[PDB]
Amino acid sequence: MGSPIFGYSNTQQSQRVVTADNLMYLRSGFAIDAIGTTVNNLVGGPVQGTNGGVLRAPIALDQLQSVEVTSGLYNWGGYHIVAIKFTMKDGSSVLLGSTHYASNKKVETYTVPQGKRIKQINVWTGGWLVEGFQFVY
Numbered sequence: 001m002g003s004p005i006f007g008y009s010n011t012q013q014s015q016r017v018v019t020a021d022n023l024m025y026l027r028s029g030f031a032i033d034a035i036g037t038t039v040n041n042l043v044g045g046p047v048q049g050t051n052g053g054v055l056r057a058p059i060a061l062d063q064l065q066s067v068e069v070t071s072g073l074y075n076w077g078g079y080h081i082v083a084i085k086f087t088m089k090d091g092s093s094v095l096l097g098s099t100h101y102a103s104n105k106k107v108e109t110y111t112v113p114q115g116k117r118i119k120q121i122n123v124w125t126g127g128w129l130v131e132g133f134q135f136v137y
């Protein structure tokens with residue numbers, strides 16, 4: 001029915017439906033600031049002051065093979081998802097976020113089953129960073 005919940009799920013859950021474009025959008029910097037499925041519906045912290053991260057190139061979810069999600073105690077506070085490495089079906093990968101500004105880190109690895117379309121992304125945020133996310137089929 002879906003992937004595990006990566007990271008943590010204690011904060012507020014928002015749900016984002018994957019459109020026909022099959023795209024996942026993120027804002028990231030030293031951690032993961034926001035996740036969405038369009039440029040307009042990202043869930044996470046606001047862009048204010050020096051916070052919010054940068055909007056990255058979208059992840060093509062139909063070309064996605066696996067994720068490597070790093071979570072830990074972020075240096076500026078709290079447990080969140082701080083880095084995600086997306087590995088595509090061609091063997092290339094993109095690393096968003098960082099593993100260098102957090103301690104007490106854990107790594108969760110998950111491979112999208114062949115021929116299963118991700119229809120929805122659940123995201124847990126407390127209004128600053130992304131604490132967790134989940135793929136749903």
Ligand SMILES: CC(=O)N[C@H]1[C@H](O[C@H]2[C@@H](O)[C@H](O)[C@@H](CO)O[C@@H]2O)O[C@H](CO)[C@@H](O)[C@@H]1O
Nearest residue numbers: 028029030031032033049050051052053054
């Ligand atoms: C590494 C990076 O891309 N830094 C960008 C920086 O990110 C800040 C902050 O905005 C983020 O919320 C946190 C957590 O990811 O990390 C850093 O502290 O934001 C700048 C603009 O706000 C960008 O110019 C930096 O590239």
